[PDB]
Design a binder for this molecule. Structure first.
Ligand SMILES: *[C@@H]1O[C@H](CO)[C@@H](O[C@@H]2O[C@H](CO)[C@@H](O[C@@H]3O[C@H](CO)[C@@H](O)[C@H](O)[C@H]3NC(C)=O)[C@H](O)[C@H]2NC(C)=O)[C@H](O)[C@H]1NC(C)=O
Ligand SMILES: *[C@@H]1O[C@H](CO)[C@@H](O[C@@H]2O[C@H](CO)[C@@H](O[C@@H]3O[C@H](CO)[C@@H](O)[C@H](O)[C@H]3NC(C)=O)[C@H](O)[C@H]2NC(C)=O)[C@H](O)[C@H]1NC(C)=O
Ligand SMILES: *[C@@H]1O[C@H](CO)[C@@H](O[C@@H]2O[C@H](CO)[C@@H](O[C@@H]3O[C@H](CO)[C@@H](O)[C@H](O)[C@H]3NC(C)=O)[C@H](O)[C@H]2NC(C)=O)[C@H](O)[C@H]1NC(C)=O
Ligand SMILES: *[C@@H]1O[C@H](CO)[C@@H](O[C@@H]2O[C@H](CO)[C@@H](O)[C@H](O)[C@H]2NC(C)=O)[C@H](O)[C@H]1NC(C)=O
Ligand SMILES: *[C@@H]1O[C@H](CO)[C@@H](O[C@@H]2O[C@H](CO)[C@@H](O)[C@H](O)[C@H]2NC(C)=O)[C@H](O)[C@H]1NC(C)=O
Ligand SMILES: *[C@@H]1O[C@H](CO)[C@@H](O[C@@H]2O[C@H](CO)[C@@H](O)[C@H](O)[C@H]2NC(C)=O)[C@H](O)[C@H]1NC(C)=O
Ligand SMILES: *[C@@H]1O[C@H](CO)[C@@H](O[C@@H]2O[C@H](CO)[C@@H](O)[C@H](O)[C@H]2NC(C)=O)[C@H](O)[C@H]1NC(C)=O
Ligand SMILES: *[C@@H]1O[C@H](CO)[C@@H](O[C@@H]2O[C@H](CO)[C@@H](O)[C@H](O)[C@H]2NC(C)=O)[C@H](O)[C@H]1NC(C)=O
Ligand SMILES: *[C@@H]1O[C@H](CO)[C@@H](O[C@@H]2O[C@H](CO)[C@@H](O)[C@H](O)[C@H]2NC(C)=O)[C@H](O)[C@H]1NC(C)=O
Ligand SMILES: *[C@@H]1O[C@H](CO)[C@@H](O)[C@H](O)[C@H]1NC(C)=O
Ligand SMILES: *[C@@H]1O[C@H](CO)[C@@H](O)[C@H](O)[C@H]1NC(C)=O
Ligand SMILES: CC(C)C[C@H](N)C(=O)O
Ligand SMILES: [Zn+2]
Length: 902
């Protein structure tokens, strides 16, 4: 046998009941410049099986407990064994208490410790975050436990299923505010040892997981509202953020969203209050700590003067995401991190539901398709993907746990759960979900528990009939990786499925229980009229008349892309759809208008249609007003841009896109009353933004003139920006493209004095749009200087230059020459060498350029490559793919564009 303290998973001999935890951050450095925090904790736990060892998590804590590292007491009249010795096992992150005798089952024990750790700027555990308010560097103390960092703040049984109540006390400077999961018990009281400090005790948490604990000490302020049921809602942020009104949007939506979910889930919000807090530079994005949710500022705050509609969308959906967790994840928690996908996939899905409640005119639900479905299909159509489900026994280390937080888990998880809600109907899904939430409140589950409760709801009715059990169906989508292409020959109605890969030559080596066969829910529209629902069983091939067409009829599968699959047809059926989109596109749901574009470009890639068929599918766009189909086009073509914008192909391409987009431009010119007013709802605003970007970047004189007039106008009155935030990135970029140092210098001016991140970002990116070599080179020489350009912005800025066709060879030469600077900013930030290499080499598509990257690599001697060591490999391999793709495609594509651009 091996010793239990050398195993990554905790024993189950001891289960926690309740913790007292007192934390004291020191926000002034101890002058060798170390920031510390101090803590004291008591954990009460119950013995289940006799054991003579107590194993508890601890990470980067020094112990100052009197005696051994802990003190051990019996609860009530329980005797307690003596401690032999206490030791720290770093690898498995344990504090280990060896006893002279055994603990007894049924008995409770209390274990006290005193400790301290660094209050580091590391976004891990109890940590510090520094930021500026005017002249002053400010410093606050805040938490991020997710996933395995609670143990970094205090010793605890730090696994999600080992839930307990927590009594939190903060000791803090007496003019700072202290926040935790729960409301404060009463007024803070002064610390007897030193009254410059106060003591804030918090009400007992519900039974909960360690990874959801939070506590924060800052000078933040709040805007507040009391929902009618008395639930207090607060948005917390920097004093000046609050004073400028930047919390108001979050406050507006929060109440409705919470309300939506309590009714959605059929389960009262389980806490007396909900705080949400905007943190500067919170690189982890957002965290759903129960009752105190943390966001990065640009995820929670919104400035109506400067922020764009897409910023607005980000805020409402992120809030909805974090709030969804307050039932799903927090109230009912997955037993182990192998099932993370459920939790994050669920939030990643219902975020759209919650947000749509708050903004019911925006059609937000649609956005899951481009946002999650097609996003994750790009990576799930690879031989190198993985199942949603991982065996529990394979997820053990903190690193292994971290690896669970990826595309597949969030976006595929969202996609397959959306599929499941749709084939069950939402009302039925809701019932099973309510049943699951009530049965498991304050406890832990596996995905099998959700299947079961959905089955119960299925079994309790007669309307929805399935081809198999919920579990049997969802097993197809959770235990094997990837997804099928579904191919329909409409001449016969034959319908087949195969595992879909973008690379037609790939060897899949990961085996499946099911031979990569799925049970597939298939909706279909024929001549614009909904057909009966069909299930493809787990067979390669089948036949149904649902999919048989006459000559002048058409059929289209997967309405609204609710199903996690792509569709191909015979060529005839494609053409009819094409002609339908030509003559009355309204017959076909906007989402499917996009599907046709997304799928066919993917199929073309996989060599299952000719690329010209995919391009034909763009032809209808000249009469398309709606956001999504255009977005499908723009997303699928950006690679064609990457590959061809230095080639003879480009002129025909631009000319084609000018042709396609001009009417959309004209449409918005009228609609927006000469551009003075924005369109009403989100989708039409998104469309306007894309149409303007596309027009301008392709050289439509009408868009070029707009951008010049507007940027001219702004320069003649710098305090009154005439450019709506929706149009800013395009108008800036185009106008700087047309202009010289007059335009460039003014914008640089505006970068240096902008106080808002979203706006600085746009200026930084537009400045890279110059068409003067000398301006792009001078700009490059700024990117390293941290006076002029922040380091965290340095490689991003170099990539934006690379992105400019003229800046490509400039960036590339610059990176080569100052590569000697792994040994200066591998020492001063992480940097992301990996993202730089990717961005600057992504256009490479010739043998000559592959010779150049190979020739670059042979500075292997010293220097090295740090983070992008395998990012270079991926560069040399991606270039090989591009060379192959360009030789196969250059001619056919050139002539398609020549032909279709008047
Ligand atoms: C975890 O923290 C809890 C809160 O601090 C502890 O419970 C508190 O214990 C306090 C003293 O140990 C009690 O305060 C007062 O003590 C005086 C003695 O001077 C007594 O007369 C009273 O019982 C009490 N005063 C009043 C006004 O009630 C608190 O009663 C008590 N707080 C509670 C129960 O909410 C836990 O004991 C601590 N856990 C462990 C294991 O140490
Ligand atoms: C938890 O305990 C650790 C071990 O005692 C502490 O780590 C020690 O911190 C010292 C600085 O605080 C480190 O510096 C050494 O000592 C003095 C600084 O006061 C320097 O002059 C020496 O140059 C320096 N020695 C070296 C080799 O650089 C010690 O390095 C370090 N000891 C160890 C073993 O790591 C932690 O600070 C302590 N943390 C908290 C938050 O209490
Ligand atoms: C949180 O919700 C509030 C209430 O629903 C929103 O408050 C509305 O803000 C609107 C945007 O400025 C205001 O509407 C327009 O204001 C301009 C300014 O002079 C006028 O031209 C328009 O006529 C006017 N429109 C209307 C319908 O009045 C509203 O004054 C205001 N409505 C209310 C009830 O106060 C908040 O904007 C919203 N906060 C955020 C950040 O979204
Ligand atoms: C955290 O605080 C709570 C309540 O303030 C404590 O719960 C009490 O536990 C004691 C001893 O088990 C019981 O006598 C009371 O019934 C509990 N009160 C309530 C309201 O439940 C809890 O013990 C504290 N945790 C620790 C570790 O002390
Ligand atoms: C809380 O008290 C601290 C200490 O008096 C204040 O922090 C000082 O702020 C001034 C400028 O206002 C700085 O120049 C000092 O260096 C600060 N001292 C330290 C140790 O940081 C702080 O402003 C007060 N905060 C609030 C919200 O009132
Ligand atoms: C959870 O859903 C249940 C069951 O649908 C709700 O109870 C229903 O409430 C409506 C509202 O008036 C009544 O018309 C139904 O007759 C009720 N059904 C039953 C069985 O009581 C319940 O109120 C919801 N609870 C929460 C907390 O949202
Ligand atoms: C993890 O969750 C399970 C349930 O999913 C918990 O087991 C339940 O415990 C409660 C209270 O002890 C009982 O009412 C049920 O009968 C139990 N159901 C079971 C055992 O299947 C389990 O206690 C949780 N694990 C931990 C460590 O808390
Ligand atoms: C449609 O599906 C059926 C299979 O069920 C195919 O018809 C069979 O094809 C084999 C191939 O040699 C014949 O030998 C069988 O006699 C056929 N079975 C029949 C007619 O019942 C048919 O080829 C498919 N059509 C396609 C893919 O276009
Ligand atoms: C496909 O998606 C569209 C939205 O893009 C759905 O249309 C919405 O349906 C709801 C209720 O039927 C309406 O309240 C919305 O206002 C509709 N929006 C639009 C823009 O039409 C459509 O119902 C979906 N089709 C199917 C068959 O599920
Ligand atoms: C896949 O295996 C085939 C033969 O089974 C081989 O020709 C090919 O090189 C392999 N790999 C790729 C990535 O195509
Ligand atoms: C286009 O089809 C829509 C929906 O079927 C219909 O309402 C509209 O009248 C049609 N218009 C034309 C010109 O065919
Ligand atoms: C790393 C954590 C902040 C992740 C969080 N649960 C999210 O998905 O937003
Ligand atoms: Zn989440």
């Amino acid at each position: 046998q091996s010793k239990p303290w050398n195993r990554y998973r905790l024993p189950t001999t001891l289960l926690p009941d309740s913790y007292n935890v007192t934390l004291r951050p020191y926000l002034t450095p101890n002058a060798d410049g170390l920031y510390i925090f101090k803590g004291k904790s008591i954990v009460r736990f119950l013995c289940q099986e006799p054991t003579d060892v107590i194993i508890i998590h601890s990470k980067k804590l020094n112990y100052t407990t009197q005696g051994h590292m802990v003190v051990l007491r019996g609860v009530g009249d329980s005797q307690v064994p003596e401690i032999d010795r206490t030791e720290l096992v770093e690898l498995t992150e344990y504090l280990v208490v060896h006893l002279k005798g055994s603990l007894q089952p049924g008995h409770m024990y209390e274990m006290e410790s005193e400790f301290q750790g660094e209050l580091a700027d590391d976004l891990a555990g109890f940590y510090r975050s520094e930021y500026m308010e005017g002249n002053v560097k400010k410093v606050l103390a805040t938490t991020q436990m997710q996933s395995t960092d609670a143990r970094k703040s205090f010793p605890c049984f730090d696994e999600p299923a080992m839930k307990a109540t927590f009594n939190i006390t903060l000791i803090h400077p007496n003019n700072l505010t202290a926040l935790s999961n729960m409301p404060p018990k009463g007024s803070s009281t002064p610390l007897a040892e030193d009254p410059n400090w106060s003591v804030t005790e918090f009400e007992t948490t519900p039974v909960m997981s360690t990874y959801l604990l939070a506590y924060i000490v800052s000078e933040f302020q709040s805007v507040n509202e009391t929902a009618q049921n008395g639930v207090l809602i607060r948005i917390w942020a920097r004093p000046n953020a609050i004073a400028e009104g930047h919390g108001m949007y979050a406050l507006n939506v929060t109440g409705p969203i919470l309300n939506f979910f309590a009714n959605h889930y059929n389960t009262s919000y389980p806490l007396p209050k909900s705080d949400q807090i905007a943190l500067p530079d919170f690189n982890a994005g957002a965290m759903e700590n129960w009752g105190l949710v943390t966001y990065r500022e640009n995820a929670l705050l919104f400035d109506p003067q400067s922020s764009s509609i897409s910023n607005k969308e980000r805020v409402v959906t992120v809030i909805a995401h974090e709030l969804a967790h307050q039932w799903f994840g927090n109230l009912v928690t997955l037993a182990w991190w192998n099932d993370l996908w459920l939790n994050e996939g669920f939030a990643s899905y219902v975020e759209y539901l919650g947000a749509d409640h708050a903004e019911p005119t925006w059609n937000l639900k649609d956005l899951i398709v481009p946002g999650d479905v097609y996003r994750v299909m790009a990576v799930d159509a690879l031989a190198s993907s993985h199942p949603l489900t991982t065996p529990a026994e394979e997820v053990n280390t903190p690193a292994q746990i971290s690896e669970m937080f990826d595309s597949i888990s969030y976006s595929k998880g969202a996609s397959v759960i959306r599929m499941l809600s749709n084939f069950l109907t939402e009302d039925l899904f809701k019932e099973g979900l309510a049943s699951y939430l009530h049965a498991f409140a304050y406890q832990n589950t596996t995905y099998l528990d959700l299947w079961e409760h959905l089955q119960k709801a299925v079994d309790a009715q007669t309307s929805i009939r399935l081809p198999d059990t919920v579990r049997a169906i969802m097993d197809r989508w959770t235990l094997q990786m990837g997804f099928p292409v579904i191919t329909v020959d409409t001449k016969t109605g034959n319908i087949s499925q195969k595992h879909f890969l973008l690379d037609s030559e790939s060897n899949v080596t990961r085996s499946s229980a099911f031979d990569y066969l799925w049970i597939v829910p298939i909706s279909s529209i024929k001549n614009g009229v909904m057909q009966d629902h069909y299930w493809l069983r787990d067979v390669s091939q089948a036949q149904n008349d649902l999919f048989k067409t006459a000559s002048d009829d058409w059929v289209l599968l997967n309405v609204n892309v609710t199903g996690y699959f792509q569709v191909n047809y015979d060529e005839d059926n494609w053409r009819m759809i094409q002609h339908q989109l030509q003559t009355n596109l309204s017959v076909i749901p906007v989402i499917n208008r996009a599907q046709v574009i997304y799928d066919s470009f993917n199929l073309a890639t996989a060599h299952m249609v000719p690329v010209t068929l995919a391009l034909d599918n763009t032809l209808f766009l000249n009469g398309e007003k709606e956001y999504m189909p255009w977005q499908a086009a723009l997303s699928s073509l950006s690679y064609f841009s990457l590959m061809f914008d230095r080639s003879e192909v480009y002129g025909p391409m631009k000319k084609y896109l000018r042709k396609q987009v001009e009417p959309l431009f004209q449409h918005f010119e009228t609609l927006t009353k000469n551009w003075t007013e924005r369109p009403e709802n989100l989708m039409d605003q998104y469309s306007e933004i894309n149409a303007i970007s596309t027009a301008c970047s392709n050289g439509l004189p009408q868009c070029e003139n707009l951008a010049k007039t507007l940027f001219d106008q702004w320069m003649s009155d710098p305090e009154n920006n005439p450019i709506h935030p929706n149009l800013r990135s395009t108008i800036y970029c185009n106008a700087i493209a047309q202009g010289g140092q007059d335009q460039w210098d003014f914008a640089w001016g505006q970068l240096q004095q902008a106080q808002l991140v979203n706006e600085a970002d746009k200026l930084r990116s537009a400045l890279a749009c110059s068409n003067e070599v000398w301006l792009l080179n001078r700009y490059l020489g700024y990117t390293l200087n941290p006076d002029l350009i922040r380091k965290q912005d340095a490689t991003s800025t170099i990539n934006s230059i690379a992105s400019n066709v003229i800046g490509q060879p400039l960036a590339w030469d610059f990176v080569q020459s100052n590569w000697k600077k792994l040994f200066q900013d591998y020492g001063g930030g992480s940097f992301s060498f990996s993202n730089l290499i990717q961005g600057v080499t992504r256009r490479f598509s010739s043998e000559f350029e592959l010779q150049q990257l190979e020739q670059f690599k042979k500075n292997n001697m010293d220097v090295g490559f740090g983070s992008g060591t395998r990012a270079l490999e991926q560069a040399l391999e991606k270039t090989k793919a591009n060379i192959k793709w360009v030789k196969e495609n250059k001619e056919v594509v050139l002539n398609w564009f020549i032909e279709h651009s008047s």
